[PDB]
Amino acid sequence: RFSPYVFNGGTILAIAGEDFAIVASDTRLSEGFSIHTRDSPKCYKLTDKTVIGCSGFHGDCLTLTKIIEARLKMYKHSNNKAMTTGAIAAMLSTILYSRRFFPYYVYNIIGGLDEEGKGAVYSFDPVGSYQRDSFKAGGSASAMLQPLLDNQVGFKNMQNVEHVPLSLDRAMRLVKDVFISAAERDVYTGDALRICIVTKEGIREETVSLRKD
Amino acid sequence: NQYDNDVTVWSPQGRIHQIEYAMEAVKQGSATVGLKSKTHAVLVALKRAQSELAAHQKKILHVDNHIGISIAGLTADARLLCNFMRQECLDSRFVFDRPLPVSRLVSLIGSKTQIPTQRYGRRPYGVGLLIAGYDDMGPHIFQTCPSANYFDCRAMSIGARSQSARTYLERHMSEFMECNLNELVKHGLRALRETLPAEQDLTTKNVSIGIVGKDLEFTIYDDDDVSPFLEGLEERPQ
Amino acid sequence: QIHSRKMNVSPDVNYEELARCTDDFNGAQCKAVCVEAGMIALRRGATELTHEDYMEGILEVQAKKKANLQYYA
Amino acid sequence: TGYDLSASTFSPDGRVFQVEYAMKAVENSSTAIGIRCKDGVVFGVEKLVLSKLYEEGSNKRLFNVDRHVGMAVAGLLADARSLADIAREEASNFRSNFGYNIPLKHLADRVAMYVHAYTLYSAVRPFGCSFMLGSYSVNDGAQLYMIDPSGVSYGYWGCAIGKARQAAKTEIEKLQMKEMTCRDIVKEVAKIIYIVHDEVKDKAFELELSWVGELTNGRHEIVPKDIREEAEKYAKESLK
Amino acid sequence: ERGYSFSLTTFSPSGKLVQIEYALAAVAGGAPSVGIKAANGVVLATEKKQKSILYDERSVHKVEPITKHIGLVYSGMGPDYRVLVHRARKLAQQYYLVYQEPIPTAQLVQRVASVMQEYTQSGGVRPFGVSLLICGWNEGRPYLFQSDPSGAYFAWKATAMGKNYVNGKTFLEKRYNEDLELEDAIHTAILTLKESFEGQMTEDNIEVGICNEAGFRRLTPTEVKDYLAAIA
Amino acid sequence: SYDRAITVFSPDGHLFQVEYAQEAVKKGSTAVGVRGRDIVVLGVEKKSVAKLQDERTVRKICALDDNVCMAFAGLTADARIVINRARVECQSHRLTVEDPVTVEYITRYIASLKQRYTQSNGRRPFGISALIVGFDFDGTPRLYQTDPSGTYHAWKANAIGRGAKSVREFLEKNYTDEAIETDDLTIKLVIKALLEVVQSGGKNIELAVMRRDQSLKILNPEEIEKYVAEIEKEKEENE
Amino acid sequence: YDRGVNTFSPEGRLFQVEYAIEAIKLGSTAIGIQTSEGVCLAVEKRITSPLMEPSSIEKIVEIDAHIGCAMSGLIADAKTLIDKARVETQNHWFTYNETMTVESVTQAVSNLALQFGEEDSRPFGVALLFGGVDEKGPQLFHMDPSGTFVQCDARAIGSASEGAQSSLQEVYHKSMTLKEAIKSSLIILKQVMEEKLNATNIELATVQPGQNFHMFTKEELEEVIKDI
Amino acid sequence: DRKIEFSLPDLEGRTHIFKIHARSMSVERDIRFELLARLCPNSTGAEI
């Protein structure tokens, strides 16, 4: 009979930096065997210091996005200040749990700064549990993406591996290489790569073309 | 007498003294003046306190990016209508994904407040809401009343001793549709300096000014950033 | 304007302002504004009449009960 | 005393003073006139300018209920626009349930019942409003209904409410509404309020005119500016 | 809307229910009627005068059946009667749907009296202004019961309500015994309506119904003219 | 739904129904309670009956748990429903947190009920006042009282009822530390108290004790005459 | 003779709210002082009987480890507002994983403060002082029975309130310290209370930026008494 | 024309009334009246 869920693809990625955070995603909205559009970014500037990514069911991504955008203004009108990143994660965990018996089909990763100018990544299940991590990939090709960042970022399984902190440019060429490497194998990887960068100054955006199978 | 007890009871002249007494608290609150240019709407408030150690009570409240209000009455009913006001902004912003037309909002406020003015055992709301906002038709300055009869205008004043401010506005209202902010605001300061005792005027902690701007979000200026606006004024003639 | 004839009045007055800020009066109360403004100037010992004298005479003709009400707005 | 408090108690001679007190507040509202011509209805509202600080086009005492049905009011503004809200919703009930536009004989019946509903109980008061309804149909001609505070409606070739009600309706019967199309009706409707609300009682007024007919293609709208400028050209023919 | 939700009937400082006291006077200002049981069934008789000749006496009725074997009359005001008439008409059906048996008259009087006392205490209502007479031959034996606006009830051999009932109870005291018949109670019922009736007593100034073991029914003006015939 | 405000403010700031209900307390029978260091004891006065019928039904002292005893004054009917709801609540504590109820907790329940009960719609306030006595866990004996406004309030000893201020004057005029030396001496203090306020010291007394680990115990009318007898003996040799 | 509960004055305000403003004059007086070092706070007890246990009554009650409260006037109604404050702060921590600010607590109670009517019954006879250390350092707020709240710096509420304010404006300044503020308060309390001051007539509680809420007891209290 | 109100004294009028009705009686010298005017919020000069 009538099914209420469908899968829209998409794959997001966040990396916490030392004084920055990088959130990126492709821009393909599509389902079945066909393409709806080649332009659908998953970057969402919540504040100047908080960017969320939303993959999964697209209508739930839109609805959840707008509900968050309401509750920020409810907080600010309640308290004469802006939310912090952990406050946003602590709220949205309750929001996701609030429909426990009819869940959103949504994966979510929040990137952004702390109160001290440090990167913070919060990855969500589709129910409402979370933790703070250094780097998480979410979406279809997250299984393609995670161990490469475990090797390069996490320095795992390497002998005599020194530990330089990740520079911003090394992170940029890391992202730009790894989405090409995912694009060569996943069918859901899009054609353009919206990259959003949160610094102490503000939000930078950048779009890099991909292949278009 | 006996015609002066309930909202339902009509006078033999047909003038309900409960509404006529609801018009008193707006005369009991402190004065404030709103106005608008071709492209900007400015309202200026006058704070009060009780002791000199006690802080001054604020009146200008932020509603939306393009909507700000001022109050005169009791703060409880002010917040009671204010939460409804925020709600009626954000729900239609949630539905239509657009800002909200100010006159259409105020019609909903009048329909909101007309209802307890007709039932039994139901007070009216004692508040004096001046409303500044933007449609696509630029600035709009509205005033309310506890009788739920909202008035469009170009400049008004409500609060205790507001008639003198009205007399100032009538003999300078022709100038207002050309001058921009830096002299428009101090025109409003020339309104609020009238309604005072003859020794104290503008001591940088009793005043606040809110502005919505043609490409500018509604911004409240308080006890600091007022000092650039507050300087450059004449002394009170005596 | 009629009962303000036989008093020393400085040209500060605005009868449009006074009559507009005074509704619900009669000729007796409007005359009573003229006499009470005619007295407060003698309380301060002034010789002519100013606008705020009429403004206080409005308050006395209204004759409100004072009870500690400053906590509004 | 004590017989004139509730809307549930009769008088010892058998009436209700609450409804009459609510009727008395209508004669403090200014003036609302409206006549129906040979092929349309023209409403006429004069509007007192209270202070100069108001903006032209504020607080309009003339409404727009349906695409074709219009309303002009005289009473208390909040209750008047409340009745405009429930009637405006009521036409949406008619078209939503039945699929065509509401006739006036049904619509004024529904609104009149809703007004009469607040004439019984100690919980609510009577309305302090009265108003006029009129529209045009190509299958039914033009209509003109007026509703008191008590909830009684009638058809009219012309009607008038406000302060100078008799001093309005005395001069309406001089006209010939049975044959005049709604063109010179604008000038005559203008003049019959031009001859009232003198500069003694009024500081200044404002003309506000509504207009409907098949010349308006059935839809209801306001008059154009130039036509009421011809009416204001027809203003100063009262000095002779 | 909603009601008032407070009783407008309080105890006096003398300890009296003043609205019930006034309602009894309103019953006492009612039309006279009387009812008699005698050894085979119950006879009810009332006094119905049209105010002029323009009315139709064949339209409305005072004697009303409640079921196959229970009739009911009153002595009081008009529009209060028909409401609790219709209520009792319902109550016999809610008995009969449960038990599949016609209601005992006493069990009817329980529920009607509970309706009246239930009605005299609740918020925002005046109490009723009638008193009833209820007849029926359940299980052979006839029965005659009388209610009141306060909600009490009694078991009368024969009594009278309306005006001059203090004279009528003396007359029935001097007249009735245990051993009579239905037509005998008819004849003395006409004889006691003639104690306080108007100048003329036609075939339609009254209305008479009877119970038997055959059940309750109502008379027509033919045999009412036959009973008023050869009477007095 | 009878929606009506009853408890309204006076023009000078009073609650008339509350202060009338305290008068209805002030006409109630006199009850006195003290606490000992190891055994608490309390008793009502003025049994006042016909002395020829039954009486267990008129006993104005109840228990709420094993460790909580309770007496009262005022009108009788409103008291026992508060007793019932208090029993349901103190059972529900054990359905929650496993320990027995502390007397401070249950008195906050009672006063908290009574205050919002004055705050509600269409309700006269309660016309009772109670003394609640409990030796808690870890054996710290204490007591409280309950105003009809609902202000729980600790004491070392107290007395409510008709003619209670003079009794309180006797208690402050007589209470020492060595008055609570022996348990029967404390009972002699209470019987000394009621006796000089309840006049005729016959069978009007109804005393009941608790030894901080037992249940309540009511003495039969033999130690009433025995303790009153030795009380009049000690006053007799004292005179 | 009997109006409604929701009737406006001819002067314009109300009747019952202003009567509640009259009602709070009978309570025991309380003084709190906002100081950049930290907020101190004090109240008397109005001890009646020697048989009465002193520590069972209180006016200091905390809401969180950084928010304390002080009450006046009627007492039994205040515990409802204390409960709503506690529940409200635990909701805010439960949903945002942070501390609700003191002003937002104060408007959260003050919105509740005026809600009586004739549907779904009277205003409250209390007067509250809120001592708090938020992220903006020390705070001090005072609300009304009418739900009107404001920030003060040294507010005195009770029977001797207008005398203590008059004796308090003369001694407060912007650069106070805590140790002088406590003794400065107790001088005023010693002036205005009835009975002889001891370690049991009064009680105090402070709150600091460093440490949490703390209430004084009869060991650390009498040093200010002997050092008055 | 004149509509003079007579209300209750605030605090200082009460203390002044204590000084009026209390000046002419043998008292303890070191009492204070301000405590009593604290104890009389709503009271008349007759009651004082």
UniProtKB/Swiss-Prot annotation, chain A:
Biological process annotations from GO: proteasome-mediated ubiquitin-dependent protein catabolic process; proteolysis involved in protein catabolic process
Superkingdom per UniProt: Eukaryota
CDD domains: proteasome_beta_type_1
Positions annotated with a glycan in the UniProt record: S30, S181
Modified-residue entries (Phosphotyrosine), positions: Y122
Subcellular location: Cytoplasm; Nucleus
Self-association state and partner proteins as the record states: The 26S proteasome consists of a 20S proteasome core and two 19S regulatory subunits. The 20S proteasome core is a barrel-shaped complex made of 28 subunits that are arranged in four stacked rings. The two outer rings are each formed by seven alpha subunits, and the two inner rings are formed by seven beta subunits. The proteolytic activity is exerted by three beta-subunits PSMB5, PSMB6 and PSMB7. Interacts with SERPINB2. Interacts with RFPL4A. (Microbial infection) Interacts with HIV-1 protein Tat.
Protein name per its UniProtKB record: Proteasome subunit beta type-1
Natural source organism: Homo sapiens
Record lineage: Eukaryota, Metazoa, Chordata, Craniata, Vertebrata
Gene designation per UniProt: PSMB1
Swiss-Prot record, chain B:
Glycosylation (residues): S107
CDD domains xref list: proteasome_alpha_type_1
Cellular localization per UniProt: Cytoplasm; Nucleus
Alphabetized UniProt keyword annotations: Acetylation, Cytoplasm, Glycoprotein, Immunity, Isopeptide bond, Nucleus, Phosphoprotein, Proteasome, Ubl conjugation
Signals that turn on the gene: Induced in breast cancer tissue (at protein level). Up-regulated in liver tumor tissues.
Primary localisation category: cytoplasm
Domain of life, source organism: Eukaryota
Residues with Phosphoserine modification: S107, S174
Gene Ontology biological process terms in this record: immune system process; negative regulation of inflammatory response to antigenic stimulus; proteasome-mediated ubiquitin-dependent protein catabolic process
Molecular function GO labels: lipopolysaccharide binding
Function noted in UniProt: Component of the 20S core proteasome complex involved in the proteolytic degradation of most intracellular proteins. This complex plays numerous essential roles within the cell by associating with different regulatory particles. Associated with two 19S regulatory particles, forms the 26S proteasome and thus participates in the ATP-dependent degradation of ubiquitinated proteins.
Location of cross-link Glycyl lysine isopeptide (Lys-Gly) (interchain with G-Cter in ubiquitin): K112, K205
PANTHER family noted in UniProt: PROTEASOME SUBUNIT ALPHA/BETA
Keyword tRNA processing attributed: no
Family: Belongs to the peptidase T1A family.
Protein name: Proteasome subunit alpha type-1
Gene designation per UniProt: PSMA1
High-level lineage: Eukaryota, Metazoa, Chordata, Craniata, Vertebrata
InterPro entries: Ntn_hydrolases_N, Proteasome_alpha, Proteasome_alpha-type, Proteasome_alpha1, Proteasome_asu_N, Proteasome_sua/b
Assigned GO CC terms: centrosome; cytoplasm; cytosol; extracellular exosome; nucleoplasm; nucleus; proteasome complex; proteasome core complex
Curated annotation (Swiss-Prot), chain E:
Post-translational modification summary for this protein: Phosphorylated on tyrosine residues; which may be important for nuclear import.
Gene3D superfamilies, A to Z: Glutamine Phosphoribosylpyrophosphate, subunit 1, domain 1
InterPro entries named among the record's database cross-references: Ntn_hydrolases_N, Proteasome_alpha, Proteasome_alpha-type, Proteasome_asu_N, Proteasome_sua/b
Subcellular location: Cytoplasm; Nucleus
Modified residues (Phosphoserine): S5, S12, S14
UniProtKB keywords: Acetylation, Cytoplasm, Nucleus, Phosphoprotein, Proteasome
Domain of life: Eukaryota
Entry's Gene Ontology BP terms: proteasome-mediated ubiquitin-dependent protein catabolic process; response to virus
A GO CC term assigned to this protein in UniProt: proteasome complex
N6-acetyllysine, modified sites: K68, K169
Role this protein plays: Component of the 20S core proteasome complex involved in the proteolytic degradation of most intracellular proteins. This complex plays numerous essential roles within the cell by associating with different regulatory particles. Associated with two 19S regulatory particles, forms the 26S proteasome and thus participates in the ATP-dependent degradation of ubiquitinated proteins.
Family the UniProt entry places it in: Belongs to the peptidase T1A family.
Protein name according to UniProt: Proteasome subunit alpha type-2
Lineage of source species: Eukaryota, Metazoa, Chordata, Craniata, Vertebrata
UniProtKB/Swiss-Prot annotation, chain G:
Entry-linked CDD domains: proteasome_alpha_type_5 (cd03753)
Phosphoserine: residues bearing it: S9, S49, S56
Modified residues (Phosphothreonine): T48
One GO BP annotation of this record: proteasome-mediated ubiquitin-dependent protein catabolic process
SUPFAM superfamilies named in the record: N-terminal nucleophile aminohydrolases (Ntn hydrolases) (SSF56235)
Top-level division of the source organism's lineage: Eukaryota
Induction: Up-regulated in colon cancer cell lines. Up-regulated in fetal Down syndrome (DS) brain (at protein level). May be the target of the transcriptional activator NFE2L2.
Tissue-wise expression: Expressed in fetal brain (at protein level).
Location(s), subcellular: Cytoplasm; Nucleus
Pfam families the record matches: Proteasome, Proteasome_A_N
GO cellular component, one term: cytoplasm
Residues bearing glycans: S185
UniProt cross-references to InterPro entries, sorted A to Z: Ntn_hydrolases_N, Proteasome_alpha, Proteasome_alpha-type, Proteasome_alpha_type_5, Proteasome_asu_N, Proteasome_sua/b
Keywords: Acetylation, Cytoplasm, Glycoprotein, Nucleus, Phosphoprotein, Proteasome
Function: Component of the 20S core proteasome complex involved in the proteolytic degradation of most intracellular proteins. This complex plays numerous essential roles within the cell by associating with different regulatory particles. Associated with two 19S regulatory particles, forms the 26S proteasome and thus participates in the ATP-dependent degradation of ubiquitinated proteins.
Family affiliation: Belongs to the peptidase T1A family.
Protein name (Swiss-Prot/TrEMBL): Proteasome subunit alpha type-5
UniProt source species: Homo sapiens
Gene from which this protein is expressed: PSMA5
